[PDB]
Design a protein around this ligand. Structure first.
Ligand code: HEM
Ligand SMILES: CC1(C)[C@@H]2CC[C@@]1(C)C(=O)C2
Ligand SMILES: [K+]
Ligand SMILES: [K+]
Length: 405
């Protein structure tokens, strides 16, 4: 329902957008969020949905707010407020200067040096999964590739058993796109409960996996505590099991419906990295925010201490003020502007792993299954939330048109 409009929020700035169930969802989730960028919509609006909160609708404000951590704090980064208040993941719930010592440790476990090391394994897994699907002439992309490819790689990095994925994925799903079975707080508590004994076990018998590295790590010279390790490992799990998975599906859904773009990458594979970036812009999918630390006038609007403001990372790149004909996918786009991996001090630490996974997928899939389409009649459904996603993606193809490598 709609929360009563607070006395300080101008009546004319009200736009009741529901980030968990946008009205234009059937047209595609990015299209649904883009309604916030239609002709008569202000740069900053207030929605009475989900408890009531501000929403910056243009890249200019989104970037500015993410850069000003003194006014826009990460302490309560999720909407609804109850979720944001329970949210204590490290380093994401912290603002600089406190954030830095923890972010450095996190970067060491998922950063570029680590992705370089996972290269061959990422490559091998992508190829094995695709080769097994190839002769079948069909697949449920979300469950047969989007999920197993990146998640198995992350579980390998974290040294966690793959049989634990169903439980962990159910929990992360409730934190980003809740179905109602669990509140954010309940899902977080369950994720922490899962981690507690594992962290204790690896602090006693350290391994070479990500959890061991975090649990036995140091933060600017001093030993990390068990609680801190838990709050950081929980965040790494959420980061590695959701966004990339859903992004792969948005991208493949698009390629399945646009033979022309597939052909472009088939004929010119060297354009894959650039295509990856353009797809990251067009099918951006994350949207979290910040909380006002004090009363502050921002772009002519009076924000009050405690107000929550959603700063959709997804919207910057779809903003026509940042990219002409934003809804059009142009792998040759000159200046691909976006904040898909965030902006400011909290820039995504797993973006290098994500780009590698996306590029590897595009290359290895198009090489074996150049021609494919969405199952006839299928009405693809998207879901909206902190991280938007694709419910299911049934694909089909003629095995005769494929080739083994
Ligand atoms: C296409 C995939 C991905 C997208 C679009 C994405 C997007 C984002 C965004 C928007 C943020 C900033 C959130 C904020 O400012 O509140 C973020 C932070 C982060 N992401 Fe990603 N991410 C992706 C994949 C990954 C992967 C694979 C990992 C690996 C575990 C990961 C780990 C992290 C971490 C640890 C942070 C927190 C950094 C900090 O708070 O300083 N991400 N991501
Ligand atoms: C918004 C995010 C993508 C980012 C990494 C996982 C996530 C859901 C967070 O809680 C911080
Ligand atoms: K008012
Ligand atoms: K909090």
């Amino acid at each position: 329902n709609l929360a009563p409009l607070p006395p300080h929020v101008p009546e004319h700035l009200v736009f009741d957008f529901d980030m968990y169930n946008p009205s234009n969802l059937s047209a595609g989730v990015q299209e649904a969020w883009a309604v916030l960028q239609e002709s008569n919509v202000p740069d900053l609006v207030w929605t009475r949905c989900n408890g009531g909160h501000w929403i910056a609708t243009r890249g200019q404000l989104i970037r500015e707010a993410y850069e000003d951590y003194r006014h826009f704090s990460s302490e309560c980064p999720f909407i609804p407020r109850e979720a944001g208040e329970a949210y204590d993941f490290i380093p994401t719930s912290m603002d600089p200067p406190e954030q830095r010592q923890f972010r450095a440790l996190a970067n060491q476990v998922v950063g570029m040096p680590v992705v370089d090391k996972l290269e061959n394994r990422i490559q091998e897994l992508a190829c094995s999964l695709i080769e097994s699907l190839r002769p079948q002439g069909q697949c449920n992309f979300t469950e047969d590739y989007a999920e197993p490819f990146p998640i198995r790689i992350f579980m390998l990095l974290a040294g966690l058993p793959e049989e634990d994925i169903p439980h962990l994925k159910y929990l992360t799903d409730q934190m980003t796109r809740p179905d109602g079975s669990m509140t954010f707080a309940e899902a977080k508590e369950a994720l922490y409960d899962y981690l507690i004994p594992i962290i204790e076990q690896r602090r006693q018998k350290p391994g070479t996996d990500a959890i061991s590295i975090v649990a036995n790590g140091q933060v600017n010279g001093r030993p990390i505590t068990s609680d801190e390790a838990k709050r950081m490992c929980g965040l790494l799990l959420v980061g590695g099991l959701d966004a990339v998975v859903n992004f792969l599906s948005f991208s493949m859904e698009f390629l399945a419906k646009s033979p022309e773009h597939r052909q472009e990458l088939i004929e010119r594979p060297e354009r894959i990295p650039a295509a990856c970036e353009e797809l990251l812009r067009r099918f951006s999918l994350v949207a979290d925010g910040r909380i006002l630390t004090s009363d502050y006038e921002f772009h002519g609007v009076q924000l009050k201490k405690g107000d929550q403001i959603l700063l959709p990372q997804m919207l910057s790149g779809l903003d026509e003020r940042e990219n002409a004909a934003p809804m059009h996918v142009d792998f040759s786009r000159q200046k691909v502007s976006h904040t898909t991996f965030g902006h400011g001090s909290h820039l995504c630490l797993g973006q290098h792993l994500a780009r590698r996974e996306i590029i590897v997928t595009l290359k290895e899939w198009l090489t074996r299954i150049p021609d494919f389409s969405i199952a006839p009649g299928a009405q693809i459904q998207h879901k909206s939330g902190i991280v938007s996603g694709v419910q299911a993606l049934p694909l089909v193809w003629d095995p005769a048109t494929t080739k083994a490598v």
